[PDB]
Ligand binder design. Sequence first.
Ligand SMILES: [Cl-]
Ligand SMILES: [Cl-]
Ligand SMILES: [Cl-]
Ligand SMILES: [Cl-]
Ligand SMILES: [Cl-]
Ligand SMILES: [Cl-]
Ligand SMILES: [Cl-]
Ligand SMILES: [Cl-]
Ligand SMILES: [Cl-]
Ligand SMILES: [Cl-]
Ligand SMILES: [Cl-]
Ligand SMILES: [Cl-]
Ligand SMILES: [Cl-]
Ligand SMILES: [Cl-]
Ligand SMILES: [Cl-]
Ligand SMILES: [Cl-]
Ligand SMILES: [Cl-]
Ligand SMILES: [Cl-]
Ligand SMILES: [Cl-]
Ligand SMILES: [Cl-]
Ligand SMILES: [Cl-]
Ligand SMILES: [Cl-]
Ligand SMILES: [Cl-]
Ligand SMILES: [Cl-]
Ligand SMILES: [Cl-]
Ligand SMILES: [Cl-]
Ligand SMILES: [Cl-]
Ligand SMILES: [Cl-]
Ligand SMILES: [Cl-]
Ligand SMILES: [Cl-]
Ligand SMILES: [Cl-]
Ligand SMILES: [Cl-]
Ligand SMILES: [Cl-]
Ligand SMILES: [Cl-]
Ligand SMILES: [Cl-]
Ligand SMILES: [Cl-]
Ligand SMILES: [Cl-]
Ligand SMILES: [Cl-]
Ligand SMILES: [Cl-]
Ligand SMILES: [Cl-]
Ligand SMILES: [Cl-]
Ligand SMILES: [Cl-]
Lengths: 216, 216, 216, 216, 216, 216
Amino acid sequence: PIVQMVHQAISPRTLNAWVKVVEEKAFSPEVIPMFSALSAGATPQDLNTMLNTVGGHQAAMQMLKETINEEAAEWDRLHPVHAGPIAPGQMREPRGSDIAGTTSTLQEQIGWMTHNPPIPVGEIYKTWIILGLNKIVRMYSPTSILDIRQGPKEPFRDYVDRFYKTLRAEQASQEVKNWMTETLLVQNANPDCKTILKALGPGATLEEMMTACQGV
Amino acid sequence: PIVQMVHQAISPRTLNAWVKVVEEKAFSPEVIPMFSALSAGATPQDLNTMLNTVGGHQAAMQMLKETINEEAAEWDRLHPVHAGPIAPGQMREPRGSDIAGTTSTLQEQIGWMTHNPPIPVGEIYKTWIILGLNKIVRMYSPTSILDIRQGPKEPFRDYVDRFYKTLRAEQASQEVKNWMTETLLVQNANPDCKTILKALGPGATLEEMMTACQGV
Amino acid sequence: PIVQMVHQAISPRTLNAWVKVVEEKAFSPEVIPMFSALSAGATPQDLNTMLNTVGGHQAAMQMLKETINEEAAEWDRLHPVHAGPIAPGQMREPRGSDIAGTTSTLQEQIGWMTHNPPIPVGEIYKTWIILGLNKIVRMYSPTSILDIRQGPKEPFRDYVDRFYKTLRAEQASQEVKNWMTETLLVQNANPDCKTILKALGPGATLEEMMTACQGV
Amino acid sequence: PIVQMVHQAISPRTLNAWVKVVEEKAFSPEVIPMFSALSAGATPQDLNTMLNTVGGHQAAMQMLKETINEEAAEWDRLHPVHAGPIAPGQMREPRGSDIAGTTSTLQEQIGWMTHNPPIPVGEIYKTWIILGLNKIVRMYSPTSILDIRQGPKEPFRDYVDRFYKTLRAEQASQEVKNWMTETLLVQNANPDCKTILKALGPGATLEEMMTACQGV
Amino acid sequence: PIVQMVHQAISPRTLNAWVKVVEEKAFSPEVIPMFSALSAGATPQDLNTMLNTVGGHQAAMQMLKETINEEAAEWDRLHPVHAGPIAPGQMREPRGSDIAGTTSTLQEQIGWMTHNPPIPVGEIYKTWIILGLNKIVRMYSPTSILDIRQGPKEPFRDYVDRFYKTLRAEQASQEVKNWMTETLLVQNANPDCKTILKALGPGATLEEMMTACQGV
Amino acid sequence: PIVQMVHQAISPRTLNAWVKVVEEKAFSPEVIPMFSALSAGATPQDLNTMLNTVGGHQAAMQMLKETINEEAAEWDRLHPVHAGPIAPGQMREPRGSDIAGTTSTLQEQIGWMTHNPPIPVGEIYKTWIILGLNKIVRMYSPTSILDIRQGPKEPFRDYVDRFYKTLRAEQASQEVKNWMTETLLVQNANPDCKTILKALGPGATLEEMMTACQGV
Ligand SMILES: [Cl-]
Ligand SMILES: [Cl-]
Ligand SMILES: [Cl-]
Ligand SMILES: [Cl-]
Ligand SMILES: [Cl-]
Ligand SMILES: [Cl-]
Ligand SMILES: [Cl-]
Ligand SMILES: [Cl-]
Ligand SMILES: [Cl-]
Ligand SMILES: [Cl-]
Ligand SMILES: [Cl-]
Ligand SMILES: [Cl-]
Ligand SMILES: [Cl-]
Ligand SMILES: [Cl-]
Ligand SMILES: [Cl-]
Ligand SMILES: [Cl-]
Ligand SMILES: [Cl-]
Ligand SMILES: [Cl-]
Ligand SMILES: [Cl-]
Ligand SMILES: [Cl-]
Ligand SMILES: [Cl-]
Ligand SMILES: [Cl-]
Ligand SMILES: [Cl-]
Ligand SMILES: [Cl-]
Ligand SMILES: [Cl-]
Ligand SMILES: [Cl-]
Ligand SMILES: [Cl-]
Ligand SMILES: [Cl-]
Ligand SMILES: [Cl-]
Ligand SMILES: [Cl-]
Ligand SMILES: [Cl-]
Ligand SMILES: [Cl-]
Ligand SMILES: [Cl-]
Ligand SMILES: [Cl-]
Ligand SMILES: [Cl-]
Ligand SMILES: [Cl-]
Ligand SMILES: [Cl-]
Ligand SMILES: [Cl-]
Ligand SMILES: [Cl-]
Ligand SMILES: [Cl-]
Ligand SMILES: [Cl-]
Ligand SMILES: [Cl-]
């Protein structure tokens, strides 16, 4: 990675942390923030290290590769490289495969990241990776938000935990998520809780909803 | 985080420590001081990393989101942003969502935290998070302080441990807590201890109370 | 903490070390030196972090709070704060609650600790905490030094281990401890060892006493 | 290793990480990226340390030695050393065995790596090692890509995981790998999935293929 | 400790390492080199931290205290402190209890250790501690070197391991140790090995002795 | 150790790593590269720390002592110390026991290692230690290379693993090792493999030999 500047290897602990996270949690949604934290200041070389150290899950890892290549091709369309000899005190313009670290060297990556103005190839590549990880989380989610229904003796808190877990795995925008919360949460609550939540009105906070259905 | 200045990634150990704390202790009151210690010098990006790495407990995490948004909206009311182009050698004034790290970049966060005078967005956001965590601790507390009663063969020390554990989870002010201690502790002690503690008078320290009921 | 100067967060390992020490050893006497080592260079904020991260033992932790408040009130009596506006290039004089970190900020704590001359608020607060921890160790000690008696088939080394373990938990001064050693150790040894130790005379070292009763 | 410059020992954690990786994963393909990450900035001395700390697998380790010697001999052919006394402020030209660290000293390795222009002997030797590791991965792969066939009740995702795991161990070029994907994946799918994938046409992404055969 | 200069706290890992060593190995001879390594650059405060963090073994720890006090009293005899006010840019001369860290402050310890010329109070105190630890190792050794005799079917290597383990715990000088090796090792070997070793003559190395009795 | 310069203590992790390596692997050949890596930049004091922290194996550790003394005596013969007072800005010439760290101080060791020109006493002593460790590995090897014979149903890969494991423990030169490989490997293979390997001719690589006998 790079930190406030200087380059260094990914630490053994960071490497092991990532490998173990994937071994333990597969593609539960919280893996993505963990990936992002473990890859802080990463060069594309470091990001490829992290992805290539995953054994198994090779369908997911292939899907990620295809997503990356799609984003790289889009970058190339928007940023076509201009022909000419690179001047003294200048860097060549990166293509998509340079950002993804397959056709660039570490020095070139360092060159772009530490240039003035900077070309943050590590952060660009990370956005592409996270887009691909989000697709995998979606695909690997066992359940739909439409099927989350409170059981007749289920504590409301447990139902809400299942609701918001499933909502998190959905790849719908924030406005759609708001509609899901406003509509389904109360609609798919059990008869007694549902009646109590409708009495609160559509202005209630989750805290107030949870407090209301505690006794039920 | 930032430390005496320079920015760096949250360490794998810090990340793992937080994840494991939540896995093991859920929302026992001591989790909050642990959160605060693990988030020392944190930018809002780092604070979101910590909260987003939690898998499960998504009712609690949603309640926390709602608390954050409430505090952000209050900030916006008290600190309305003034229209105009930002001068050379100046930072734009942060709105609530900039403090909570959803509409600001890391450089902007670094910019505010290291400015002269500083705008400590990390510490402001942390106060909002801790307010939300305190609400969750309250809500998830199984017991009321009014129901803590010493058993007829219960060592006074064990009763006092249960009393002060339950008191800690109550979200009443320090003056109310003082009344609880002065009134209930002795009132809800078992017959023999209760008689002995009333004989000490209302000036006794906890040490003296504990020593008095040792033999009982 | 602060180290030779610069401030930084308490490390996750330090935090975990302290939590685990308390989980494992409760209030055995060796916990106090461990506390002191783990809190080296600590600000009052860091010291409160350490104490607040303890879950359970809330009778002990309340006793500690009361001890701290007693020491803070004594500080206030000896060091009454003088009214007036604080000059440029000067620090306000700390009251007891500033030393204990409940009414002071981290910058103010840093301000006092790094001032010339220094006001070591962290070390002052640590002495108060250790006074309180010593009271808890005393109170939680199961045994009195007067009751430590060598069994008729007990190796002298095992008896001496029990003697000095119990002596360590007593909160009597060094002169009283010397009397206990000079008087009780030999007095409460078993018949055969006791006779052998009285023959050595009152000038014998512990090494010589232990060697003498090896064969017994 | 060397990091942005300064030399230092390989850390105990790096050493242990490598030893344990080999103990646990043998020569699964992901071991190679792990080797590369753990050997970041390595001198040839450090690389030999890593390889020599492996106990067991001595057939593989001998094959690696032979691969290294082959690459060293090729280097010598392409870069024959010129006779003459080495000038003040100059380094002798490295032969293959100097790059592999058997006839050079640590200072000489440091000398080449930190020279202007640099002669990155660590990175050259690492390419040779990885060539040898790739040969071992190939040789130790239990299965051929031609034999990966979806079972009649096998989830398509599981079949794809096995396909891309086996493909990764093949030491065929990227163009051959593309042919394998375009031809075999669909060809060796089970009757019902195979029919569904042929209906998608040869433009489908893996995501689309996986989604199509979810219900099957 | 102090390292090339700057002071810092003993690390949690160092603390834990020492505690665990004592828990696991008690007073086997190798504990002393481990103590010495873990206490590298230690101030007397750090050395007391290490000794005071030991729970149990309080007979041994008391014997150590008595040994320390004996060495402190000897220091005082050889180095009597001269009366007078300490000059600007000068340090007071340490007494035995200042070296052992009970009557000196950390700053004073730092003062002596970093003075020109240095007064290495940490290293002086460490020699006293190691003298005391050696006495404990001796006292706690279960066996005498005179009783180590090779069994009639015991591999010579196992006998030699027991011999040199027991020899290490003896607190006799190097010349006495040489006599023990030259005399007893061969004398207390089993009949067949003993005959073979006497045939080698008194010039044989241990390697040659071990090789000679391999087949036996 | 010393690192690019500055001196510091051996880390607790390094110490523990070495102790555990010896506990787990005894004197398997890979222990020596591990020793060398863990002792990088070591002073003789640090090297003695590492050797003295070993509990048990005291026959081996005595053999190592004798090997060290032999090398020290050889050093003394080749480098006799010249009588005279040591000049300002000069170091006394080290004798063998100064190199082995028994008659020199840490400052003197630092003095030699950081002098211009340097006298690398740590690296010299390390060569002596490794010579002694190699003697122990030889002596403790259970098997001879002449006795490694492929079983009639043994996979060739398993036979080759045993061959090269045993070869590694032999203390014969590289030319002798080459003869062993060229002669014995094929000679001591099982009837069917042996016939197949003789058909390849004496130019075959190990990879080619292993591939040839895969089906057998
Ligand atoms: Cl995995
Ligand atoms: Cl998953
Ligand atoms: Cl890679
Ligand atoms: Cl790869
Ligand atoms: Cl850009
Ligand atoms: Cl970047
Ligand atoms: Cl569900
Ligand atoms: Cl969780
Ligand atoms: Cl909870
Ligand atoms: Cl995040
Ligand atoms: Cl998230
Ligand atoms: Cl502000
Ligand atoms: Cl802040
Ligand atoms: Cl309770
Ligand atoms: Cl606890
Ligand atoms: Cl206790
Ligand atoms: Cl706190
Ligand atoms: Cl708290
Ligand atoms: Cl003061
Ligand atoms: Cl302080
Ligand atoms: Cl007892
Ligand atoms: Cl292995
Ligand atoms: Cl393998
Ligand atoms: Cl090596
Ligand atoms: Cl080797
Ligand atoms: Cl080159
Ligand atoms: Cl290199
Ligand atoms: Cl398969
Ligand atoms: Cl212990
Ligand atoms: Cl012992
Ligand atoms: Cl202490
Ligand atoms: Cl103590
Ligand atoms: Cl001195
Ligand atoms: Cl010192
Ligand atoms: Cl024995
Ligand atoms: Cl051992
Ligand atoms: Cl062995
Ligand atoms: Cl030592
Ligand atoms: Cl030793
Ligand atoms: Cl030399
Ligand atoms: Cl050296
Ligand atoms: Cl074998």
